């Protein structure tokens, strides 16, 4: 079925591969070549997850956990039950995420819009490959990647974090957090502002964007604008994910001590490093 205004947009063209072979829809979903690719990687990835569940001996989704190979395996291949499945599943996931992005690009072309959406989705992919590929490779073993399990992958975060004391002191980790917090702050303010204008007090007529500007100037003395906030939110969210990959690619590769030690270059400067008193 279509939306009332959808038909005029369902024209042929815009594909990158296969011409008009896969240029059609299944219900709402647009297929395309990379839609077939996505379905293929996805289906194969899930099969291997189900397969790992059989080898594990449980079908409870909260216990299934596909572990990577042991550190002793380095960056070589491992048998399916000893980490090979994690390796193949990782390949599938990567193929699915990428295919999903290229499918979005085909949709951008057929609608004549920009490519901002798949470009932003690539940041998320980057962060995934940072944890499962870039960082393990730089450290010399797939075992450093995280396990595919609902709860076992949280323990990996806790184990990996506490290997370096309190991960909070990772300076790149602070910056990323700041963008995540600031982002949710900006997202709440933006949604509230549009709704407050489109849904004014009772007995009031719908507000204008000038009211939005005026509200935020009255509140904090500056309005970024209807275009600037969407730019801002795109940049707060991508920057949050950027410094997240950054704060991990450096951990265990160029930094090995506890992250609180990284802050000693400020404490211990030979001039004030000896002045008695204070915390230090």
């Amino acid at each position: 079925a279509l939306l009332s205004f959808e038909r005029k947009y369902r024209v042929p063209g815009g594909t990158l591969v296969g011409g008009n072979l896969f240029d059609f829809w299944v219900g709402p979903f647009y297929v395309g070549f990379f839609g077939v690719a996505t379905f293929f990687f996805a289906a194969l990835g899930i099969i291997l997850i189900a397969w790992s569940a059989v080898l594990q001996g449980t079908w409870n989704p909260q216990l299934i956990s596909v572990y990577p190979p042991a550190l002793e395996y380095g960056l070589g291949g491992a048998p399916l039950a000893k980490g090979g499945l994690w390796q193949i599943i990782t390949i599938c996931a990567t193929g699915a995420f990428v295919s999903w992005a290229l499918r979005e690009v085909e949709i951008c072309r057929k609608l004549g819009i920009g490519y901002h959406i798949p470009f932003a989705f690539a940041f998320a992919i980057l962060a995934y490959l940072t944890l499962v590929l870039f960082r393990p490779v730089m450290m010399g073993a797939w075992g450093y990647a995280f396990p595919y399990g609902i709860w076992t992958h949280l323990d990996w975060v806790s184990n990996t974090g506490y290997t370096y004391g309190n991960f909070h002191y990772n300076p790149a980790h602070m910056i990323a957090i700041t963008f995540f917090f600031t982002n949710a702050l900006a997202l709440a303010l933006h949604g509230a502002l549009v709704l407050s204008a489109a849904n004014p007090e009772k007995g009031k007529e719908m507000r204008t964007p000038d009211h939005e500007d005026t509200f935020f100037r009255d509140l904090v003395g500056y309005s970024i604008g209807t275009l600037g906030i969407h730019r801002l939110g795109l940049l707060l969210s991508l920057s949050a994910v950027f410094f997240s990959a950054l704060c991990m690619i450096i951990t265990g590769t160029i930094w090995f001590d506890q992250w609180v030690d990284w802050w000693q270059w400020w404490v211990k400067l030979p001039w004030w490093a000896n002045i008695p008193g204070g915390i230090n």
Binding site: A1, L2, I113, D210
Partner: protein
């Protein structure tokens, strides 16, 4: 059992209702679903259509109630490719002129969008007292070049969003004297020229014209912006 287990169960119930509400709220436009022949689709999904809601538009411009009887209010120059559903609909004529596909436009109101005081939100800079170029390259006077590397005209004015103080269109004087509006988001202002990758020099004339030299209506904006974005797909043959 305990106060924690009850709180987490109460929340999941609350969240299921919230998704329900959020989803029905996002069905006030474009629903009910249609078959490709315009008739209502048998399968409308598990979420029901929301109950109408009314906006009182400012400046005495009526009231919008959504959802309501939908209508394109314009002819669509497309024909089916297949008996079965889910396949493209091919343009029957010129898609850029017929305004279909990436060249689509919505039959919005033939009235300019107004600011909070009732004045035209978008005005040419030559009619905007005090406005000027404060930073960046001033494109006025520069030649406008299409994707075929031919010159189609020169910039003669900028249409600005006054309440936002933002350039929205370039007014380009064609070789025949007339002018056309170019979305600011589709042009590339350079040191010596303005380059439009979306259209070829001989496709600028096809850009829909406006009926008043000092104002542009919402309908005209949609026709202008659609046509230009449609060039990316339909003007590609002669794109160097």
């Amino acid at each position: 059992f305990d106060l924690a287990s009850l709180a987490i169960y109460s929340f999941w119930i609350f969240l299921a209702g919230l998704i329900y509400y959020l989803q029905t709220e996002n069905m006030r436009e474009g629903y009910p679903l249609e078959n490709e022949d315009g008739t209502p689709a048998a399968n409308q999904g598990p979420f029901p259509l929301p109950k109408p809601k009314t906006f009182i538009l400012p400046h005495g411009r009526g009231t919008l109630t959504v959802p309501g009887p939908e209508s394109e209010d314009r002819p669509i120059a497309l024909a089916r490719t297949a008996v079965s559903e889910g396949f493209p609909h091919a343009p029957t004529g010129d898609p850029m002129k017929d305004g279909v596909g990436p060249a689509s436009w919505v039959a919005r109101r033939d009235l300019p969008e107004l600011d909070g005081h009732g004045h035209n939100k978008i005005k040419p800079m030559k009619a905007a007292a005090g406005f000027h170029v404060s930073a960046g390259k001033n494109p006025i006077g520069l030649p406008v070049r299409g994707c075929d590397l031919e010159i189609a005209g020169k910039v003669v004015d900028i249409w600005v969003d006054i309440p936002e103080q933002m350039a929205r269109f370039l007014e380009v004087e064609l070789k025949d004297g007339s002018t056309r509006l170019l979305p600011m988001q589709m042009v590339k202002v350079q040191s010596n020229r303005v380059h439009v990758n979306a259209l070829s020099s001989d496709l600028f004339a096809g850009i829909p014209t406006i009926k008043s030299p000092t104002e542009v209506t919402l309908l005209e904006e949609d026709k202008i912006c659609g046509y230009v974005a449609g060039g990316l797909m339909y003007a590609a043959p002669k794109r160097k």
